[PDB]
Design a protein around this nucleic acid. Structure first.
Ligand SMILES: [Mg+2]
Ligand SMILES: [Mg+2]
Length: 994
RNA sequence: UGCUUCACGUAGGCCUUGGAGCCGUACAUGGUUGUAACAAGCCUAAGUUUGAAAGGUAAAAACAAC
RNA sequence: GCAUGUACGGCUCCAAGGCCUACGUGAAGCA
């Protein structure tokens, strides 16, 4: 029957078009691919895995790979996938148009369609909406027949593999009937596309459940195993499986996983007063490791090993704030400092016109950088001797070039694909442009890591990076304010106004001490500071000396510190002698170690045993550097291996430091102030020069961002009202803790702290009380911020918020841990706890109906990437409202079993629409003159078997319910209409012929 | 007697992240005088979640000589 | 007998995800 196949194909193509359009709504870079910037791994193909990708996976991987956010993340693909993905990305628009056309052609009521020609006629008065020409349709049809042939060949080979593998009498007859029909049908006929090809095309862009239903309804047969369950399974190797993740190449769940892995470990802070914490942690770790290396079962070992606390030696919070700012297309007007690459050095040398004297060596065959630089290094390119080998213009040019070369960071316009932010001592570097008297001046700012954190906090909480000004009202962006600060700093530096607040900042946090605190005449060095410096040096030297004689030093342990100590001792003795001998700066400079001599001396001392008889060592340490190395000539001659010369150096150093602590009076403080380099309190005569230096290259404090107008700030400020030492970070911690999160500070202060006793002070408090607490507080805040960023990336991956309640800890009341770290830390088990999602009626497009109920559904977090993307929540709200589902144990309306009931109702509705469409088609195809004399519903009602059971209104309600798939229970008036329709179908015997 | 769909275990592979150790490459920085600590780190307040002010120490960014 | 930073490649451990398989179960529908 042609009508049966036509209706089934119309339904299948409509479903395929709806599913395909549910993924793409806008352009999404279609037909504009430019390759992927990702390190592709050619992963081997799994055994016993059927080849072939559905159209949905083609679309998803074409979108994910050729996106732009995939910059260097080391994705995994199979063999021969990139070129076919490029072909699909080229012809996806044609594929979409072909699917839409085919759906429109098959879904016809008036003048029932015939077979689809090889040309796909689609014209004349029948279809005067020609959207595909001969060549475009030819390309799409060629792609389809290629895929059809590939699937047929793969299925035939898999079928042929069965007969060799043993088998019996029953197996032989089952494999014989299926090969002849699988190899039987073909894509091509006499200008007629076969029905099997159309079903294959329709099922290629569906899901496995709908494809299975359509294949089962394709042929009645006997409802048993359809041709050994092999012809029916021919069309389902495509039609994406569901319950299979589509976010493998998302590049936003990648950062979420990175953040989770970072947060799943305990920090190792370097505070002196936190040592008992880590001592207890080490003892516990060692004891439980020893206990775990005695087990006999996997489960017992897993239970024992849950008490071990992993640790990390450092954390990078400044990188994650900068990455968050770069992802949201912020900055955009600054110039960030990036790490220098060898390509950057090569390009700088090329543009600077310095390797132009390479006689055009044309080393372009190497292509990759860091090898051409190797060739110049082998050639004899040095660049470190070219500040004295040319006329006076050399100083203006080569010194600046050398200064640029020594810097290891470069300034570039920020980009999404750029990630190598320069982080030096937790700081970042920005470069802005200001206008003064109609001139563009570049200003460099060192931005603290707490400015960025407050910026990210303001962006995350309010949603906008705008801060309301205290005066003159109005809202200003945080991308701004920085530029105003730079301009005002420049203006104040020119005006020399360093005794008033800049932006209500109490200008000692800005304007460093060279400008805000000066004296007129040079100060007099006090007696106390020299003694303090001498005592500190003595204490450090004797501490290292005492610590050295415990590892027994058999030419091992630290050697750099020893060489530094010898060199410092020699230099200090030489300086003390030279000041008394009254030598000028140039006299001492020529009599000391320059760069080359210092490098040679360091190498010789590092390899002391290697050079003791070579003439180079004698020439350096006994001929040239005679006066400088005088205090050590006697020891170096009768010694070797450097382990004795270090002891002699430490002995001489300690003897000298003891011998000086009684030769420092008020009448000779100048000499040792010069020797130990203690200075005064700057000069007023050099205020202008320092202002000129500082007006361009200054720093940005973290108090520039004010959280006064954030929601809840006034209540928090009034609540405490007595913690005189409180700061703005307590507000951040309070806000982030009220939203749900975990930090290792909670575990440290509630599970480990009560078990240990701290060393007490003279007063009776904890020794090192202040800094320790600050340290702990610091950790908490940073960790909380990181978690927030992670949650943000979750919203960028699954499209839904992360709503979950984290349980709070309880203080320890025992003498043992009794609480495993891997069971207390929630980031270890974060994929095994239900999350909340809010479901609301969507109606048409992105328009949530106000004053409508909102439902809360609990869903496992491993179902957010497979069977939650593009789910058509209208079915969920229809099932919740129209039906009356029951709430199970801990009643919360789980997404599971809701999916199951919804799928069952969808199958029932599919049967209903098939039946109604067949009956409507038969009714219309006959009484065309009667219909042409809504009135169509009245025509159907008159041409039926109703007496008093239902009116035209009931038929209309049934038709709108069935056509649009509004999920409702069976009720009563629906059953009689279905019985009448079945009676009509059986009376004419419409679907019983072969 | 069985059929598919989910979910949980058990055992394998094949990839990708996170911490720690042993490593190796490859590159950059390292010297003597003065100017230079606004930014970041360390030490000082409370036996429980208080980074404000103050006192030391501290050379990350910068300027000029060999 | 060397310190810091950067990028890469290993080995070694732990852990987390994703894809394939092969055995058990638990549940929903169908013959
Ligand atoms: Mg999943
Ligand atoms: Mg302070």
């Amino acid at each position: 029957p042609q009508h049966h196949y036509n209706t089934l194909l119309a339904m299948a193509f409509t479903k395929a078009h709806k599913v395909y359009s549910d993924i793409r709504g806008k352009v999404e870079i279609d037909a504009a691919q430019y390759e992927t910037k990702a390190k592709l791994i050619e992963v081997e193909y799994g055994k016993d895995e059927t080849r072939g990708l559905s159209g949905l996976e083609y679309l998803m991987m074409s979108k994910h790979l050729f996106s732009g956010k995939n910059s260097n993340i080391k994705l995994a693909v199979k063999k021969g996938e990139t070129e076919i993905l490029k072909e699909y990305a080229l012809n996806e628009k044609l594929i979409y148009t072909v699917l839409d056309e085919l759906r429109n052609f098959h879904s016809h009521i008036f003048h029932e369609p015939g077979p689809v020609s090889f040309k796909n006629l689609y014209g004349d008065e029948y279809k005067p909406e020609k959207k595909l020409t001969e060549e475009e349709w030819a390309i799409a049809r060629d792609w389809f027949v290629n895929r059809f042939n590939d699937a047929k060949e793969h299925k035939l080979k898999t079928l042929a593999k069965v007969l060799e593998r043993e088998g019996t009498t029953e197996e032989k007859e089952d494999a014989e009937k299926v090969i002849k029909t699988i190899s039987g049908y073909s894509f091509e006929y006499n200008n007629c596309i076969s029905r099997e090809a159309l079903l294959f095309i329709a099922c290629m862009f569906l899901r496995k459940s709908d494809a299975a239903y359509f294949t089962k309804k394709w042929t009645g047969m006997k409802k048993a195993e359809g041709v050994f369950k092999s012809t029916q399974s021919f069309f389902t190797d495509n039609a994406l499986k569901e319950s299979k993740s589509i976010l493998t190449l998302n590049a936003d769940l990648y950062k979420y996983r990175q953040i989770l892995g970072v947060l799943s470990t305990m920090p190792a802070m370097k505070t002196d007063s936190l040592k008992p914490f880590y001592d207890f942690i080490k003892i516990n770790n060692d004891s439980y490791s020893e206990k775990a290396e005695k087990a006999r079962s996997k489960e017992e070992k897993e239970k024992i090993q849950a008490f071990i606390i992993p640790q990390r030696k450092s954390s990078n919070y400044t990188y994650w704030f900068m990455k968050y700012l770069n992802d949201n297309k912020l900055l955009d007007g600054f110039r960030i400092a990036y790490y220098k690459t060898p390509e950057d050095r090569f390009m700088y040398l090329i543009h600077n016109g310095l390797i132009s004297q390479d006689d055009l060596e044309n080393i372009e065959d190497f292509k990759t950088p860091d090898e051409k630089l190797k060739y110049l290094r082998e050639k004899g390119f040095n660049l470190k001797l070219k500040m004295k080998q040319a006329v006076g213009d050399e100083k203006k040019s080569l010194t600046e070039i050398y200064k640029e070369t020594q810097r290891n960071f470069v300034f570039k316009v920020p980009t999404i694909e750029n990630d190598n932010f320069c982080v030096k001592k937790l700081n970042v570097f920005f470069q802005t442009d200001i206008e003064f008297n109609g001139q563009k001046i570049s200003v460099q700012l060192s931005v603290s890591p707490d400015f960025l954190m407050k910026w990210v906090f303001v962006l995350l909480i309010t949603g906008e990076d705008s801060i309301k000004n205290a005066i003159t009202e109005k809202k200003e962006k945080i991308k701004d304010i920085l530029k105003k600060y730079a301009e005002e700093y420049y203006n104040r530096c020119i005006t020399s106004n360093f005794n008033e607040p800049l932006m209500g900042l109490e200008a000692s946090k800005v304007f460093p001490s060279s400008l805000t605190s000066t004296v007129e005449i040079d100060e007099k060095i006090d007696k106390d500071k020299i003694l303090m410096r001498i005592s500190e040096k003595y204490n450090e030297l004797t501490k290292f000396d005492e610590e050295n004689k415990s590892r027994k030093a058999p030419w091992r342990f630290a050697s750099k510190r020893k060489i530094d100590i010898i060199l410092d001792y020699v230099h200090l003795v030489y300086s003390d002698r030279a000041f008394d001998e009254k030598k000028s700066v140039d006299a001492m400079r020529h009599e000391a170690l320059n760069d080359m001599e210092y490098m040679d001396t360091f190498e010789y001392l590092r390899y002391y045993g290697r050079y003791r008889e070579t003439e180079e060592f004698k020439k350096i340490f006994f001929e040239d550097k005679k006066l400088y190395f005088s205090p050590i000539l006697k020891a170096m001659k009768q010694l070797d291996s450097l382990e004795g010369v270090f002891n002699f150096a430490i002995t001489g150093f300690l003897n000298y430091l003891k011998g000086i602590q009684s030769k420092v009076t008020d009448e000779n403080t100048n000499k040792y102030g010069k020797v130990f380099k203690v200075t005064g309190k700057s000069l007023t005569s050099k205020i202008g020069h320092h202002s000129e230096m500082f007006s361009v290259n200054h720093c940005v404090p973290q108090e520039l961002i004010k959280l006064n107008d954030i929601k809840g700030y006034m209540k928090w400020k009034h609540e405490t009202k007595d913690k005189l030492w409180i700061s703005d970070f307590a507000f951040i911690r309070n806000v982030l803790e009220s939203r749900g999160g975990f930090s290792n500070t909670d575990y440290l202060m509630k599970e480990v702290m009560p078990l240990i006793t701290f060393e007490k002070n003279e007063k009776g408090s904890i020794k090192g009380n202040t800094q320790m607490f600050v340290a702990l507080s610091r950790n908490k805040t940073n960790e909380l911020m990181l978690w927030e960023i992670g949650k943000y990336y979750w919203k960028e991956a699954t499209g839904s918020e992360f709503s979950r309640l984290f349980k709070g800890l309880e203080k320890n009341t025992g003498n043992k841990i009794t609480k495993a770290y891997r069971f207390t830390n929630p980031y270890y088990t974060i994929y095994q706890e239900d999350l909340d999602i809010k479901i609301q009626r969507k109606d048409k497009k992105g328009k949530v109906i106000v004053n409508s109920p909102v439902y809360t559904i609990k869903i496992k977090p491993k179902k957010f990437d497979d069977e939650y993307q593009y789910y058509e929540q209208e079915h969920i709200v229809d099932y919740i409202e129209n039906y009356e589902p029951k709430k199970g144990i801990d009643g919360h309306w789980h997404f599971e079993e809701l999916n199951k009931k919804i799928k069952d109702e969808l199958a029932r509705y599919l049967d209903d629409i098939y039946l109604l469409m067949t009956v409507e088609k038969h009714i219309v195809q006959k009484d065309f003159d009667k219909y042409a004399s809504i009135a169509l519903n009245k025509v159907i009602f008159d041409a039926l078997k109703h007496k008093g059971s239902f009116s035209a209104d009931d038929l209309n309600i049934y038709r709108i319910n069935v056509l649009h798939q509004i999920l409702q229970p069976k009720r009563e008036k629906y059953i009689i209409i279905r019985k009448s329709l079945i009676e009509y179908c059986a009376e004419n015997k419409l679907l019983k012929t072969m």
